[model samples]
Target: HSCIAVIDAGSTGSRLHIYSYDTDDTNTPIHIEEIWNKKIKPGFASIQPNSVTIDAYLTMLLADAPIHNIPVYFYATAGMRLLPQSQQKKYYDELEYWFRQQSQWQLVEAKTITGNDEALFDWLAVNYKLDTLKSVQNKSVGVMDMGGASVQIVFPMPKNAEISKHNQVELNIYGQNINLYVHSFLGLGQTEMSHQFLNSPSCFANDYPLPDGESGQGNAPSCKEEVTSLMNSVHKVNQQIQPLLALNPVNEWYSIGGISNLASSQLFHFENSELTNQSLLQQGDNQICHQQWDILNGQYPDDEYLYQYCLLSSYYYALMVDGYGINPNQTIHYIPPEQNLDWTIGVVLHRA
Candidate 1:
């Protein structure tokens, strides 16, 4: 099988995506298709971080993959980035040992990737899946990945020397060379941001208990305002990315990560795999925010994340519309969360 493995060592878990493809005359992947996928619980760094545990975890994750003797990219994300170099090395050392034990499943690279680099792969993967990478067209595409501890925004822009070198990436793929603008906002992830605002009443459903012994009042507008203060005053997103995006308008917006979960919730109705910032906010305000916590809990038993829907809806709206300067009514695309679509596919397109 002409395939390669891309394992996203995400914050929550490790996921494997094996893709089979053929290359064109330019050595660019063509007709690339995901052949198999497997996901395991707990992140790579979150595990016990030793050979004993690493061996077992790797076995359980890769032993059953359909193919062996292929390249494997074990790219860790923000979770691994949180650790110090020494701690990260401990995990990677064991991983290298595990690879040495196996004759096949060649390890290409295994390290924590920078937020900017991950954003570049994210944009490439989304565009490849959308069938927009074969040849340059007039359409402009933008991609956003919202992880648990960080968020990334990437879109097309000519290389500019004025901005920091890290903010832009120039790539030649599929016979087309293009320049891109990329940035990842640390500490803006849902899980990381939640720790800062668990006590904010306006961000939760009615009657939900706050950490400070108060109950949630649930107001999207108010919650958005609060989150906006952090994005602007703290992250400086408005001054950083807004002006750039304004000049290079994306014809369409696509997002990955928790947005799909929010859109797929029974409370939110969407015909296409798309939603507008305005509609999402309105739904969150009317359905989750205004509803009683006890009533909602009883109605949707399987909604494990139902409690935070109010805040999530507001936070995303704030990030997109306020922080990045996207339009309120602009429609954005997302794979249904279960689809397991991710940036790993881009690895197949570019093994290097």
Candidate 2:
């Protein structure tokens, strides 16, 4: 259809975007027409584990808009993904009940995309956002979307690459085609990381310049300590994966999500000194950092707005292509067939 609403709901909040297609197929030029975003407090829906909070928030989202009979495509991320299977099912049961009671319109249940699926939806949105049709001619590029909860790394491949779960690491070296490789990890997000540090003290051992004094109990470790700990964790992950990166060289990393967007500021760090050292370390590796704005909050004005972070976009993209019945050919380019390509390896990791 010409107008379809795509909603991305996550742990932190939800994003609703109205996609206007030039044609019927998903491959058509999709214009984002309207957006609604809102934040449901951390414990409101999660603590008592009530699904009503989500429905209430969602109901408020479409209230102002003329939502009658419009086909809405919904995609729920970490919040639904993290819920236990039983709890998730219950949430849905309750969601249906709540929607019927609140609005006169019928509520069509939307699909809750899993870790991998979420990645693909984000890639689709980003590709359109970047106007990839005009930028990538015949070369491959990597998309690295780092969100609050997870990270997704994808590389477009060529036509001949094989398809297998274990085969995801393989690459397509054809200059004309792009290959995709994705890795999605849960419980590695900022909140999760914070929770980890808060609940356990030993997790900081790797990054601590010195032992965390006995006073460190409950709540996330100091922010400075958290940053140091995260950098240390990422360093360890990089060490193990460095050989793989060398095997598949990429042009640049397209880092997105709120964290990536805010990485340039001192808020993630503190003071100029910490920032300088952090920058120095990052610069030493010859890494090119590029910031991408989140389209979710940008397009939505009516609903509450909060950032839903993760590194799951690429993983989702790979699965979506598979869902579309595309054979996993290690040599197929993902940035559309009309563009040139460059190669880059994008990765995400969490602190232990």
Candidate 3:
């Protein structure tokens, strides 16, 4: 049995996925099992310049596992990409030192991946899992990944689609040639948008507590207006890439959102779980922003992140409806719980 591990050091957290496989006489790989999967929070960005802490964390994660001679790859995402160049080098150097000290596992590569690479990995994973990898002629689904620090949209280029050269990605996977339209927008992700909202006066809630502990009431309407205004930038980008959207069937637009451990929980909570090809409506008489705010307050009464969720959910809805120019009655899919939605599996396949 052989083992392979991919470490996705992402903005929100770090995830480890260990997979095992057996090779046949023809040297074709057959899946065995996923031996270990775990995640640690506060991401690499928060613990940077502290190699000792990261080493301890890794040790604890692999303590009971057999890592000898196994190939392990580390690919840091948006969070690390945001770090200062000097700090990034320091982190990389520390990681190298730590890996050198551990002679057991084979460290293949350790570095931060570009946003475009991240989107490509995600596109590979989604299409591979959907069993659409064999035929390049088939219409492949798109990937919409909304992470803490960035958002990505990747889809196969439609026939005669007029895509900019910079946005087109060419890849040969599993003997199939794929030409994809990929775009990643930093500062448009859920967490980044929350930060933007906090900085913008019109987007802040009137009841939000100021730094000095004074309560300032936020005008919900004004906040909604501000968020919509900000989303126009994303809309402009989507407009340029409209060909990909037009090529994708309504049902094949997969959305990667919601809290950890809950697949499409946000959509399920806000709309009918069984309904497809339907618009996400506010439902109540209140303004959409107020509705989400009230829902967030009610759902997480004591949670400190209620405000963030309110803004995030509202923004997600607005982005899908207004920014992407999605059909009001569009269908969306969520990655099933049994399937691994992260890009690690795709990275593993690509590396192999």
Candidate 4:
């Protein structure tokens, strides 16, 4: 058995995952286990070019790990890619310097990966965990990842779907050649979407106290219309490539579920109602929004950020049902709190 480490520096946070696995004579995995996992918030983008902080954080994370000459990979996602070229270079140089100073770790690679790369790794991780990648089959599951800065959709192409070459990723895994349709839309993530309405009054609940000491008369219907309009604009631009909603043989577990659990799903459900496969999303109803905001405000009444939850819920619903064209009745999955859904595990397996 041997161990490997992967660091994911994302737009919202940084995560470290260590895996221990054993291989058979044919190089097939006999067993795999995750030994350690940790996460830190306010991603690299917010800290930009601050090598000292990053180095210190990493050192602390690995302090208790049973370090040896183990392979470690650091892959920065969309956050780092958004930095200027010179800034990126400086970050890389500092990372290399830090790695060289460590005697027990072998830095295999440290660099920023493209959006497509992010989507590919994420797809592999989700499908691999579901055991859908062990054999060749005509039907496969799809992945929809909604993060803080971007959203990615990756799935097998339908027979009549016309996808651009730039948006398709071809992979050879376990003796099967798979061609997938993958695309990442920037500025559509939950955080970025909320940023668009920071000072706006179009979406907040009626009781939300604004900065000017005035309360908003919550407009749920108007908010839905605005969200739908924004999503439609994006959908028109990417209309050539069919979304996962258009695929056939759709399984109940086709989506990535909850990519992160920082926000409670309870905050997203309507009053006296649970989200189920049979419930249709009423885009303009503010009753649920009002109830959720009231509950959040009660928990943190002094914090004004509570109202943002209401706005986030509306946008998230619109993004999936209105923007991505997902069926309103479909039940999206959320990763279990106990599971590690990090993509680095899949990346390591692919390389092995």
**Tens digits of lDDT, candidate 3, 46-133:** 7847778878767765666656678889899888888888889888888889889977778899999877788888887776667676
Spell out the clash pairs found in candidate 1. Answer: none
Instruction: Look at candidate 4 and give me any clashing residue pairs.
Output: 206-218, 257-333, 258-334
**For candidate 4, lDDT tens digit of each residue in 105-205?**
88899888777777888888877677777677666567777777777777776333454666777766666677777777766776777666655455776
Over the full model, what C-alpha lDDT does candidate 4 score relative to the true structure? 0.65
Q: Pick the candidate with the highest lDDT.
A: 1
Winner by lDDT between candidate 4 and candidate 1: 1
What value does the lDDT take at residue 50 in candidate 4? 66
How many clashes show up in model 4? 3
Error of 4 at 265 (Å): 3.3
Q: Once superposed on the true structure, which residue ranges of model 2 sit more than 4 Å away at CA? A: 24-27, 35-55, 96-109, 134-136, 158-179, 198-247, 266-352
Candidate 1 per-residue lDDT over residues 113-213, each given as its tens digit: 88998999999888887788988778899999977898999999998879999999988888999899999988898898888889999999999988899
Off by over 4 Å in 3: 22-32, 48-54, 135-137, 158-166, 199-225, 234-236, 243-251, 259-278, 281-288, 291-310, 336-340
Each model's lDDT:
0.89, 0.39, 0.64, 0.65
- Estimate the TM-score of every prediction: 0.95, 0.56, 0.78, 0.81
Sort the candidates on TM-score, descending order: 1, 4, 3, 2
